[PDB]
């Protein structure tokens with residue numbers, strides 16, 4: 303009886319195995335755009351993905367992820383609200399059963415069809431396992447997906463999902479350029495939070511881009527054909543793999559932009 307997103311093992315149950323689920327800096331949150339304060343001291347985000355080396359694509363029974371070589375400073379996030387340099391480990395998505403839900407963060411209570419997370423860890427801690435034990439260990443870059451025009455840079459991902467349908471499956475996924483997933487603007491909101499799946503560790507500086515990317519209905523339909531289950535188990539579509547907004551508590555969301 304592992305955790306998941308269903309009625310009997312979903313987000314409302316997670317606190318039993320992971321008591322930090324009711325902690326002081328949990329994610330995601332609703333971003334109330336009128337209460338977020340513009341911080342003129344926030345630097346532009348520095349996204350250096352030119353030398354990114356993607357390795358594999360994997361269905362982990364809760365999302366799919368594209369993994370990168372994080373053994374050197376090849377694809378790094380710095381600047382913005384961050385001190386130091388953060389290496390790209392992986393990206394993954396959260397999405398809905400229908401277009402009106404799927405994102406984890408919300409914007410004035412609006413839910414997007416999906417949300418892309420690019421997960422990075424602070425090189426001062428040496429490895430990601432160490433970094434998850436630190437309050438400034440990880441930086442996750444969050445990008446909203448709306449449904450409209452296709453995102454050409456996403457298509458290579460969508461086209462291999464047939465090959466990793468069920469939990470456990472992975473495939474080679476080299477030479478993928480994550481720059482093709484980014485919107486024009488790097489205007490962002492930032493706040494201190496957590497991982498949004500178990501272990502829910504409070505180790506994340508969240509950087510959520512204001513500008514969504516558009517993806518097509520056909521692209522998001524391919525996400526929804528994935529399965530939570532392993533091959534040979536009853537088929538349960540991998541949909542609604544998002545944690546709802548959590549209490550903001552004693553936190554301020556800062557905007558990089560007016």
Ligand SMILES: C[C@@]12CCC[C@H]1[C@@H]1CCc3cc(OS(N)(=O)=O)ccc3[C@H]1CC2
Pocket residue numbers: 419421430431434442496497498499500501
């Ligand atoms: C593998 C691991 C132990 C060492 C490294 C750990 C990763 C770090 C990246 C990551 C991103 C997640 O999704 S999100 N949504 O919070 O970005 C959710 C969870 C984890 C944990 C799971 C546990």
Ligand SMILES: [Zn+2]
Pocket residue numbers: 394395396419498
């Ligand atoms: Zn995520």
